[PDB]
Write an enzyme that holds these catalytic residues in place. Sequence first.
Site, PDB file in Angstrom:
ATOM      1  N   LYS B  41       0.806  -1.192   0.000  1.00  0.00           N
ATOM      2  CA  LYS B  41       0.000   0.000   0.000  1.00  0.00           C
ATOM      3  C   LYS B  41       0.847   1.254   0.000  1.00  0.00           C
ATOM      4  O   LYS B  41       0.325   2.294  -0.384  1.00  0.00           O
ATOM      5  CB  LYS B  41      -0.947  -0.025   1.179  1.00  0.00           C
ATOM      6  CG  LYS B  41      -1.902  -1.207   1.114  1.00  0.00           C
ATOM      7  CD  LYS B  41      -2.739  -1.185  -0.144  1.00  0.00           C
ATOM      8  CE  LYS B  41      -4.030  -1.992   0.081  1.00  0.00           C
ATOM      9  NZ  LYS B  41      -3.736  -3.237   0.785  1.00  0.00           N
ATOM     10  N   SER B 268      -1.669 -13.031   3.770  1.00  0.00           N
ATOM     11  CA  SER B 268      -2.155 -13.052   2.390  1.00  0.00           C
ATOM     12  C   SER B 268      -1.077 -13.488   1.399  1.00  0.00           C
ATOM     13  O   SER B 268      -1.414 -13.949   0.295  1.00  0.00           O
ATOM     14  CB  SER B 268      -2.704 -11.669   1.995  1.00  0.00           C
ATOM     15  OG  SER B 268      -1.666 -10.742   1.695  1.00  0.00           O
TER      16      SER B 268
END
Lengths: 307, 307
Positions: B41, B268
């Site tokens: 991000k 993830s």
Amino acid sequence: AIYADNSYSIGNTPLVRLKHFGHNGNVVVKIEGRNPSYSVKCRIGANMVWQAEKDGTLTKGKEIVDATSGNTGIALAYVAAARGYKITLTMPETASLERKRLLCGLGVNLVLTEGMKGAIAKAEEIVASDPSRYVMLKQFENPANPQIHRETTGPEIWKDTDGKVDVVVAGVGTGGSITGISRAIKLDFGKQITSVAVEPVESPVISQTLAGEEVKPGPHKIQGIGAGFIPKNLDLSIIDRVETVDSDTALATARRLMAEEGILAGISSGAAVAAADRLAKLPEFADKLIVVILPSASERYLSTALF
Amino acid sequence: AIYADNSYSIGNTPLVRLKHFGHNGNVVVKIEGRNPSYSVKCRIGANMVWQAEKDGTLTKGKEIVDATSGNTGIALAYVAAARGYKITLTMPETASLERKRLLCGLGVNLVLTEGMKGAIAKAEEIVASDPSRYVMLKQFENPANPQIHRETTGPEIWKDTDGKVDVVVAGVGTGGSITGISRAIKLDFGKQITSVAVEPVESPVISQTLAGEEVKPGPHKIQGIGAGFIPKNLDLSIIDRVETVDSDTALATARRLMAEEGILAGISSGAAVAAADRLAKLPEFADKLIVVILPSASERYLSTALF
């Protein structure tokens, strides 16, 4: 390109100019937190394994054994995993349950001692238990520690500053960073920079030694530096200057790096920057480019005084 | 070179070949954990701020407001600090006290809600309280999210594989990674790769949608993906394949990456690798180069089921 395992991905860490430290952007920081296991030790964890492989003391089947205060153990652990060695690290109960769960996640076989001297001797006990099976890499004296800094970290600083670097500021734990970096820039590239070692004011054994004073180590909170003795991997002869910093200021400076520069710095990163900021505001360095090593990243300190 | 602030240091993350997954090294992983605030991000936190600056909706004095499940808030927070904006993030009490102390360390003004929908509306309340002072960047729909992946992450994959990449595997949270990467490789460089979205088997809304089935989201442990709806920043039209993974296998795969590859992967990351490993062992992909996005790093998960 594509690295054959995670150890080969060490280094090539960025330089970022500080805005709220130094004078007119003369202080720049090297983010060693951006490494395979997220500290400056990923470089020496890789190179100590590689070099032990190159000279046959590390072979298929032999098991790595060692004692660490943390970052080096994490670094050796990821390299042991990437390259298929079993590893045992000696830790008392002194240490963050953080690190215990991290090292276990990386597949380390751990122990108990109950501080640093105690776990070291226990590691030595294990290597004695079977010298044909166990190899101890000894970060404080293994020359492959400063060597990797001379071959990667130093040249990266040279190229990313286009040879304009004038000062390198680095805290001393084993001494390998300041030593290898200083040798690359002064001897391989030939520029007479100022090499500045940083140590805690609470345990200023390097300053005390160089002054011919009584060496008196003490307790502090600046994790990663201030081992309380002069390590063999610190080449005193290339050290131009020693700056001392106190624990409180080290922690405040790291919190400032986060909140004011957007840099997720570790505790010793604030120490190195506080020393660099002092130099940077002396007129003798105001026009000089200062490069500061930030060894680790903020999240490894979440259970510490940093927050 | 020297970056003017930490936001400019995004990207240029390494590719590492896996040894205990895939078939004869055909699976390679992209370590997005090596970024300014240590996740994928950081790229969109930077570019959403830059682009809001380029079009005047973000100015000196205006305050960033938003809601996050975490990585994007950390990313926006470091960029706000580096570039001198105040920021408020909306968090219930749902979240790791980890993150609360991290975001506070980065200088964020926080709140309470008591889950995601609830904190979102509270953020919307604040922007309504003064629309001239508050700017909401809206990661799920802001095109600057996939755009930064098309301009950096995608081209980095192209160059580091010398155009040999055949498959890109990425979990879907906002959809910006798979979308921007796929657009760069297919449209800008012109290679017809297989773009593979990954979602939790517990919340397979993308598979359910594409099959014309009832969309039924559910709970899972794969943090960062499986938002339970189709985000606007997921360009369905470039998605060739959807692979589902269960939470248990996602966690086991991440633990394997640490202990067997020496890669400090997030939850993830194990999800994405488990899907890539399944494809990699189908003979139709056995000779093809598969590149997998690993969005985050292990230490952000120390209080989770990962350990």
